[PDB]
Design a protein around this ligand. Structure first.
Ligand code: B12
Length: 179
């Protein structure tokens, strides 16, 4: 049972990581990769309160607006498809909620993880990569084959980012199982 103070800290940390990373889909030499997708999966795993999700979605949107208006980041990725990010975040939340159902924290538990992880990321990847492909307007003549190319391009790096964070969150949990 966390005190209201400890919760505030957690919240800020989330928002912060978003603020810092949301501008890079994958790791630079000078930059950390967007932590948003692992964050929503992790809220599925851990957090019961439901308001927390639509609250962080708020923050995601705001952080993006600022970064593009004031922070001078491309508005390339912003389009009518933008809003498909939301079900992508819910799919990541639900997928964490799933993993939690049958956990065991065993080696087969890590094998169970690697599967869910693949599955939710894929789903978000369709919604974001595919939604942006077909519905942004940036692509003159989108087709299913060009969608597959895209998917093959982005799915893997963007699963790596996810992996790095979720694994690092598992590494940080055994530090709590041993305290
Ligand atoms: C690059 C990129 C960025 C860059 C900025 C864009 C830029 N152009 O500089 C960065 C890293 C800054 C970025 C930021 C964001 N992104 Co972004 N971004 C991408 C990415 C990786 C590519 C966009 C793209 O389509 N490329 C341009 C196209 C035309 O290239 P391509 O067809 O794939 O490749 C062609 C070229 O390589 C060309 N070619 C090859 N060699 C050469 C050489 C030369 C010289 C030339 C001219 C051409 C050329 O040929 C290829 C044709 O097949 C996509 C990934 C994706 N599609 O899933 C996301 C994506 C478009 N962005 C997305 C989003 C949402 C964002 C953010 C708004 C929020 C976020 N973090 O999720 C932020 C921006 C706000 C913020 N900072 O907080 C989402 C959009 C989702 C949606 N539903 O609309 C996508 C789909 C990623 C996702 N979440 O899966 N983005």
């Amino acid at each position: 049972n966390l005190t209201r103070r400890q919760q505030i800290a957690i919240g800020f940390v989330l928002v912060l990581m978003m603020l810092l990373t949301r501008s890079h889909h994958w790791a630079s030499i000078h930059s950390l990769p967007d932590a948003s997708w692992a964050i929503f999966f992790l809220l599925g795993v851990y957090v019961r309160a439901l308001w927390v999700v639509p609250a962080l979605i708020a923050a995601s949107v705001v952080i993006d607006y600022v970064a593009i208006t004031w922070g001078g980041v491309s508005d390339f990725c912003v389009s009518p498809a933008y809003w498909l990010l939301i079900p992508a975040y819910l799919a990541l939340f639900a997928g964490g909620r799933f993993y939690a159902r049958g956990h065991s924290l065993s080696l087969l538990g890590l094998f169970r993880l690697a599967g869910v992880a693949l599955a939710v990321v894929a789903v978000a990847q369709l919604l974001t990569t595919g939604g942006f492909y077909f519905y942004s307007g940036r692509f003159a003549d989108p087709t299913l084959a060009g969608l597959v190319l895209r998917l093959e391009k982005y799915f893997p790096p963007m699963l790596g980012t996810f992996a790095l964070y979720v694994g690092l969150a598992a590494t940080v949990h055994v530090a709590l199982a041993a305290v």
